[PDB]
Amino acid sequence: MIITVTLNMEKYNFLGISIVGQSNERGDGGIYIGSIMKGGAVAADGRIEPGDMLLQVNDINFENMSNDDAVRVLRDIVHKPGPIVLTVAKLE
Structure with a gap:
């Protein structure tokens, strides 16, 4: 199951996730x-859970990227104006 979520950054401010691993x-x-993390945009949305695989944010793909680089890129994305659209593969 793939789910794509448009985050409400205007209301919830920060992503509030941690990420583990890499391809x-x-x-x-x-x-x-x-x-x-409670109180962040990802918590607010309700559909993403721990263990879900982070696939894409906007046009940026997170497969085949180091965890170091992903942390950096997520910071960069959230700091830019405009929508944040997150796609995950649901953990079975």
Whole structure:
């Protein structure tokens, strides 16, 4: 199941997630939601859970990217004006 969420940044301010992991060199796996902080935009939306794989934010793809780089990119994205649209693969 893939779910794409448009976050309400105007109301909730900050993403409020932690992320764990990264894709292997072959391209399997990716970056997962480790935790979701109460009071942030991701918590507000309600549909994303811990263990979901973070696939894309706006036009930026999170497979085949280091966790270091992902943390940096997520900061950069949230600081830019405009919508934040997050797509995840749901953990079974």
